[PDB]
Design a protein around this motif. Structure first.
Motif, short mmCIF file in Angstrom:
data_model
loop_
_atom_site.label_atom_id
_atom_site.label_comp_id
_atom_site.label_asym_id
_atom_site.label_seq_id
_atom_site.Cartn_x
_atom_site.Cartn_y
_atom_site.Cartn_z
N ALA A 1 -11.31 5.22 -7.10
CA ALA A 1 -10.16 4.84 -7.92
C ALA A 1 -8.85 5.10 -7.20
O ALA A 1 -7.97 4.23 -7.18
N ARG A 2 -8.70 6.29 -6.63
CA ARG A 2 -7.49 6.68 -5.90
C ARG A 2 -7.38 5.86 -4.63
O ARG A 2 -8.11 6.11 -3.66
N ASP B 1 -16.49 -14.29 3.50
CA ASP B 1 -15.51 -15.17 4.12
C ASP B 1 -15.32 -16.45 3.31
O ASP B 1 -14.20 -16.95 3.17
N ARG B 2 -16.40 -16.97 2.73
CA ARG B 2 -16.28 -18.21 1.96
C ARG B 2 -15.88 -17.91 0.53
O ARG B 2 -15.35 -18.78 -0.17
#
Lengths: 101, 49, 101
Positions: B3-4, B47-48
Motif C-alpha cells: 500500500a505504501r 505490453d499489449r
C-alpha cells in the motif's frame, strides 16, 4: 513525424508531442505491410519498450489539461503527513467525483 | 504491491503471514468448487495490455 | 420504368434507378394477369435472379442518404489493425446507438 511501419523511427518524444486523441488514429492509419529493412537497434521488442514510455508520458499531457477539471488528489494512505505528532495521517479512498464546476 | 508507495523493501514482508494462507484456501479450494473444473491461469502480455 | 407483368423487362438498372420508396408503389399497382408473350431470356427463374441485383445495390445507395445520420463502419472482428506488433486488433459489437445529431 513518426511512422508506425518503420521500427527505428518510433521514439517517445515523437509520440508525446502528438496529443492522445490523434495518437489513436495514427496507429489506426498506418500500413499493414511493415518495412523491416530499418529495424530498431534494441530489437523489435525494444521498439515496444519505447512506445509504452511514450503513451505513459502523453497521459500526463492529458492530465495537465484536466487539472482545471478535477480537484487536488490527496494522498491515499496513512503514514504520509507533515505534522504526524500532534495530529495523525489520514488517507482518502479516491471514491468521490473530482469535478470542477 | 504494497500500500505504501513510499515504503518499499527488498526482503521484508509487508503483508501479514495469514495473507498468504488465505490465498491458497481461495484458489485451491473455493475455485475448483465454483468452476467445477472449467477455468485456467493464463500468462499475461503486459505490453499489449 | 419496368412493367412487372412482363418478365423480359426487369433489369438491374430499372430497379436501382427507381427509389426504394417508389419501389413499393410500383409493384403494388401492377396487373394481376401475367402475360406470357415475351419471356425472360434466362427463363422465368432468370427474372427472379435479376430482380434482386437492383434492390440490394440500393442498400448502400440508401446508406449514402443515411451516412450523414450514422458514423463510419468500424472493424467488428479480429485480425484488423495496422500496428499489430505493438497493440492488438479489436472489434465493435455494434450494440450502441449509431445516430448523428
Amino acid at each position: 513525424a513518426p511512422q508506425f511501419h518503420r521500427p527505428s523511427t518510433i521514439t517517445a518524444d515523437n509520440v508525446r508531442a502528438l496529443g492522445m486523441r490523434g495518437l489513436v488514429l495514427a496507429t489506426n492509419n498506418a500500413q499493414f505491410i511493415m518495412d523491416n529493412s530499418y529495424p530498431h537497434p534494441h530489437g523489435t521488442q525494444g521498439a515496444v519498450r519505447e512506445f509504452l514510455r511514450g503513451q505513459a508520458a502523453a497521459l500526463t499531457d492529458l492530465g495537465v489539461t484536466h487539472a482545471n477539471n478535477t480537484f487536488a488528489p490527496q494522498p491515499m494512505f496513512a503514514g504520509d503527513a507533515a505534522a504526524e505528532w500532534l495530529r495523525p495521517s489520514f488517507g482518502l479512498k479516491r471514491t468521490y467525483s473530482p469535478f470542477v464546476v | 504491491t504494497q500500500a505504501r508507495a513510499a515504503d518499499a523493501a527488498d526482503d521484508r514482508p509487508h503483508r501479514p503471514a495469514d495473507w498468504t494462507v488465505h490465498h491458497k484456501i481461495y484458489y485451491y479450494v473455493l475455485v475448483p468448487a465454483f468452476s467445477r473444473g472449467r477455468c485456467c491461469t493464463a500468462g499475461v502480455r503486459f505490453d499489449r495490455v
